[PDB]
Design a protein around this ligand. Structure first.
Ligand code: BJ6
Ligand code: BJ6
Lengths: 127, 127
């Protein structure tokens, strides 16, 4: 997968990169720590489902949207992503099963995991 | 990041260092000026994707390979690098966002930027 690569970026690193590049950043609106950080960093943002371009360019989704449907949607949007592994924790998936879904991503993406060791493990599951 | 240091070496200085040390030197094949110099200094070289050991030890990549994927691959090769900031200009990244990706390099690397002033800026961004 030449179009996908894995780093270990905290939220501030992801947001800073997304701010500068305008890459699309998926965000699960049920993850309170991320939603709260976004609401504080970009005062006045009206978080809603779908694309919200305000401060950074977000794709807000609910965990009621199944991972494969989310990936289907993101593929159709045809935007480069900065993202965490989709479905990981939010949909009750472990890292390996999140990686299995991410194989269906056809858009370029930077995938951020928790630690440098998780980078190696995730890439192993992905391939 | 004790395994990475920043210098200001032009292309000929980078090639001379690579030729003697056999450190792996990533090269973006879309950067015509660099490719033409390599073909001139190392006549007969067969440029193709991946490791090419001819004159110097190169890793040729296309900008269709995402920056994080390239760093994943270079980390897996486990070779010491002589390199420019990956993604800078070639992937539409400024120096700061290139430096952000470079934080994921786990192999030792000498990073060459365009001027001594850029050494200061890059080191500030990297940390
Ligand atoms: O004003 C209206 O009618 C809707 C406004 C709205 N707020 C939210 C939100 C806002 C903050 C946190 C979590 C949810 C949503 C929403 C977002 C994702 C998926 C589905 C819905 O939609
Ligand atoms: O003959 C064969 O087997 C391969 C021929 C080849 N030439 C090139 C090249 C040669 C010069 C300039 C820019 C590209 C590539 C290539 C290099 C990097 C990434 C992808 C492809 O591949």
């Amino acid at each position: 997968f030449q179009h996908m690569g894995t780093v270990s970026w905290n939220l501030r690193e992801m947001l800073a990169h997304a701010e500068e590049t305008r890459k699309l950043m998926p965000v699960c609106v049920e993850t309170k720590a991320i939603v709260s950080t976004i609401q504080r960093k970009y005062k006045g943002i009206k978080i809603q489902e779908g694309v919200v371009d305000y401060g950074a360019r977000f794709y807000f989704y609910t965990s009621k949207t199944t991972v494969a449907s989310l990936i289907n949607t993101l593929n159709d949007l045809n935007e480069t992503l900065v993202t965490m592994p989709l479905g990981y924790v939010t949909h009750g998936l472990n890292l390996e099963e999140a990686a299995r879904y991410m194989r269906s991503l056809k858009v370029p993406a930077t995938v951020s995991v928790s630690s440098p060791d998780a980078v190696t493990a995730y890439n192993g599951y992905l391939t």
